[model samples]
Each structure stands twice: as structure tokens, then as C-alpha cells.
Target: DKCPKGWLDFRGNCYGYFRYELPWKRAEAWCRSIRAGAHLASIHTSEEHRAIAKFISQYHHGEEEEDVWIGLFRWNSVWAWIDGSKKHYSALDDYPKGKHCAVLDESSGFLSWDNDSCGERNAFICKCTA
Candidate 1:
């Protein structure tokens, strides 16, 4: 029931924000490598999403606003979480016209998502059972 050091505990899971930039797929892989069952964070509620945003804001020391990759991605026109979590909520800010991956825009109060290219490099968040 405890999160690892340097990780945040929320609900029944633990989260960690990695500052190193990586593409969407690579970021997911990195999360998986952290621990068994770890994966890009799958936000399912506004409370959890806000908690994650606050967690990132507290740890982030960048001089300017930045994007952070989440677990949501588009495949064959369907958006799904990399961790296979149920899609019960969404925080999207705009239509995902040409993008396949979702990023939380820090400039947007870290509460909304913007779809972006999967190959684009960005810092990411990971979640695992606590």
C-alpha cells in the first residue's frame, strides 16, 4: 500500500513523473521497465487527473511550460489506454484530427489533453499498483 520513494500515491496506484523526454511508445516501454505492471498513467476521473497534474506541477522545474505524455493513444481511429484501463473519462481540449497520442498541456492548467504525433518526444508519467 505504499508508493516507492520519489513516487506519488493516488487512489490505489503509484505514479512517477519522468523528466527525460521520449517518444510515446518509448515512454510506455520505459514505464514498463520501471516495475512489473507499470505503464503510462491511465486517468479515469477528474479527481485523479487533477491529482496527477498537481503532482507534476510540484516536481516539474522547467523554465517554461511543456507537454507530458499520458497513456491515451489512437489506433485505427479508436483511443485507448496503453495499460488496458477502461475508457470512462476524457479531458480532451480539441479534436484529434491528425494525431495519435495524447499529451497533457502544462500551459492549459494541466487539466486538458491535446492530441499529438506519437513520434514526438516528451516527458511522461507512469503508474503502477501500489
Candidate 2:
């Protein structure tokens, strides 16, 4: 694997979880700043989804669950990944109205996603080709 140092390799991609909280737009920009093709993580399967949650759980500290930003967002009232892939795999726990960004919710010990405002500050995960 050609994953960069300090990034975790999984299924031919490298992922980095940042604890710093920022708005979704800023968080995405931060990911891009790390590397040319880097962007917020885009989960495509149950295995990958669980792996990411497990990975996050390792560094997550606190009794209460934490929300971490992923690459999923609502555009034109439809959901899409930051990478522009049209895969339909979804792990959403809830889809309340008025929120356009998705966050991986750790409240259940297994990460599931929930819609939230793009302006909300939260930790985020980034991914790039390995």
C-alpha cells in the first residue's frame, strides 16, 4: 500500500481522522490541503463503515458519544458523497429535515450517520487513494 505516514490504510485507500472540530466546508478544505485528492471519507459498504467506526472508537475519548463528519451531504435535496460517486450504500440512522451535512454518530457504540447543518463544527475523517 502507498498510504502516507500517519494515515490508516484500508481497502486500497488511506484514512485520517482529525479530532479538530470545524465547519463542514472548512473541514473539507482541510482534507484537500493534506493532499491533492484527499477529501472527507466516503463509505461504500457495511464492512468499510464498521471499520471506520472501529477506527474512530480507538482514538475517541469521552463517556458521551461524539459526532464525526463524513463526506455525505445533501445537494439539490439529494444525498451525495464528496467524491462524486453515486453509490447508494447508506448507514443513516436518521434523516431529519433542514440539515444538509452528514455526521457519523457514535452514540450507539457503532457508528451510524445523521444529518446535520453544514455549519456545525465537528471532528472529521479524510480519505485518499493509497
Candidate 3:
């Protein structure tokens, strides 16, 4: 999908990439700087998740890398996107119990999104538009 300059348009939403690794909270802060509407990327369906995963794989370096911060967080014992959008689809199966954030762990599987320490550094995806 053709996106606005400096972004990728996918499934009617604009996606942005930040190659520099940062903690989950820091990543979201950087995303907001890219645009006024920018936020941590949110996945509402299987196809969105798959497409993002493929996109990440295309740019990610090395096979051993796994940590890639995403937008989901544990909220009141339930997983929720950072933007507070409704979660219609989930790739999570083994959710860990703790105050953790989510990530695209390539080691788990091609389409896996797993929880990780929000304090750890990792590349992150952002959603934004012109």
C-alpha cells in the first residue's frame, strides 16, 4: 500500500517504523513525535497482524532478534491497546501474569505477538497519517 511520505499505508491506516530500539513507553513517545495522530501501532485483525509481521521481517536484521515492541498493555488484568481501541483479534495464547507490555517476538513464530518487559529496548511500530 502506498502511504504518505515517510509512512506505509496498510488496511486504510498509516504505519511508521522506528528502527532505533527503545523501551515500550519511550517508543510510543517517539511515535507521537512523528505526527500529531501517531501512536503505537494497533492490530485489530489477523490480517493486520500478519501484514505487520511480514513488514517487520522484511526489515529486521539477523535471525536471533525477537524483541519488537508493539502497542498492547495489560490494563486492569485485561490486555488493551495503548490507544484504548477495541481489540477484535489477538495472537496471544500464553499470556504472562504481570504489569507487562506486548511485542513482536520473532522467535516464538512468524505471527506471534507476545508480552515483554516494557522497560526493555526494542524496535517499535507507529500509526500515523498526514
Candidate 4:
């Protein structure tokens, strides 16, 4: 399948970097609205992580905080990807209370997944299977 304009293709899926910042829930909703079955960004492997990391890293304007949102979130006590994939991968260094949304945190000098408030507005990633 053809990627929609600027979307990037990797493996058998397409990834998009949205230009505007939106809350985590709104971001996922936007992804689904783009196409059926599309969901917030879900990273499965170290390679996928690196690709997303690089993509997000470009937007950093020397900010003291990392604010990009991905798809992983805590459901009850268990974390799961928004794509319905098994929870087999995560880069979380620690979980923050009340913030279930996953983020590509660079505050610690490298990209690591960190939990943040779902209400926080920030740039986000989206994934669609091709």
C-alpha cells in the first residue's frame, strides 16, 4: 500500500509524525480517524525505538523536557500498546503516578520511555498497518 504523502514506511507499517501538539487521548483519536485500525505509535523492537527516537529527536529545540507521546499506557496495573499488541516491550525507566501516557523522554541524556500526564499537550506519533 502507498504511504500517504510524507508518511514513512518501515517493515510493513507506515508511521507519521504529526506537526501539531495534542493531548495523548486526542492524538490517538486523530490516528484512528485517519484510517480504520490506525492507532497511536507502538514500538516493538529496539530498531523501531531508534527510528522513532531519531524522528522525535529532530524536533527538540533544546527544551529541558521531553514531550513526545507514544501509544503505551497503563491499563489498570498493566501497560499495553494501543494497537492491541502484547505488552512485550517497553523502555520505561520508572512509572510516574497519575500519568499513564508514555513519552519518548530525553531528559536523562538518551531516549527512554517515561510516563506523563495524559492531559499534557505535545507532538505525537501515529502508526498504521500497510
Tens-digit lDDT track for model 1 on 1-130? Answer: 6776799988889999998899999999999998989999999999999999888887746454579999999888788899998998999843646688999998876888989888999999999999
Root-mean-square deviation per candidate: 1.7, 2.0, 2.6, 2.6
Candidate 2, residues 17-69: lDDT per residue as tens digits? 88898999999999999998999999998888988887888874644447999
The ten-residue window of minimal lDDT in model 2 covers: 57-66
Per-residue lDDT of model 3, residues 1-130, tens digit only:
3455756677688877677889899999998887776789888888877777766666646444556777888866788888768887877664455538988777855477778878888888898643
**Predicted candidate 4 versus true structure: per-residue lDDT over 1-130, tens digit per residue:** 8766677788888888785779999999999998788889899888888877665555546453356788998877788898888777778864447888888776743367788889998877889987
> TM-score rank, highest first?
1, 2, 4, 3
lDDT (C-alpha, whole model) for all candidates: 0.88, 0.85, 0.76, 0.79
- Number of colliding residue pairs in each model: 0, 0, 0, 0
Which structure among the candidates has the greatest lDDT? 1
Question: If the candidates were sorted by their lDDT against the true structure, best first, what order would they fall in?
Answer: 1, 2, 4, 3
TM-score, cand. 1? 0.92
TM-score result, candidate 4: 0.86
- Better candidate number, 2 or 4, judged by lDDT: 2
